[PDB]
């Protein structure tokens, strides 16, 4: 899929948002809302990869693709 770069830190404002740190690279899922983009974060637990999706401000991310 498409990637985006975190321009600035962002603290999630609800469970439906994701927290970013400046310099993070995330997957872009949906950018059709002008203000809020749905992105995807990955974690690993015991060597297995899980994913969580949620909104961040479109202005806080830059498309890399």
Least distance to Cl ion from the beta carbon of 11, Å? 11
At which residue do the structure tokens 């603290």 appear?
Answer: 11
Asked whether position 2 contacts Cl ion by CB under 5 A, the answer is: no
| Interacting positions 30-59 with Cl ion (CB under 5 A) | none
Alpha-carbon torsion angle 65, 56, 37, 7, nearest 10: -30
Q: What is the CA radius of gyration of the chain?
A: 11
**Window contacting Cl ion (CB under 5 A); options: 7-15, 34-42, 46-54:** 7-15
Least distance to Cl ion from the beta carbon of 24, Å? 11
């Amino acid at each position: 899929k498409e990637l985006v770069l975190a321009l600035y830190d962002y603290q999630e404002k609800s469970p439906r948002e994701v927290t970013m740190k400046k310099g993070d690279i995330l997957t872009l899922l949906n950018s059709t809302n002008k203000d809020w983009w749905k992105v995807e974060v990955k974690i690993t637990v015991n060597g297995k990869t899980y994913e969580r999706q949620g909104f961040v401000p479109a202005a806080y991310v830059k498309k890399l693709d």
